[PDB]
Amino acid sequence: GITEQCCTSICSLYQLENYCN
Amino acid sequence: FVNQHLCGSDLVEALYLVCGERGFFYTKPT
Numbered sequence: 712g713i714t715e716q717c718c719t720s721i722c723s724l725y726q727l728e729n730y731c732n
Numbered sequence: 733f734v735n736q737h738l739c740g741s742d743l744v745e746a747l748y749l750v751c752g753e754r755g756f757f758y759t760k761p762t
Contacts, residue, residue: 713757713759714740717743719754721735722738723735731754
């Protein structure tokens, strides 16, 4: 899951930008 | 702005600013 690495963990402008195609 | 927690709502917002016009998958592990 990706919404977990951010909501269940931490997420920066790079982690969420690594999800935008 | 430092690393933080964000899900769907505030999560795609972040996905939005980071990319936004690039569109993201934002999958939901249900």
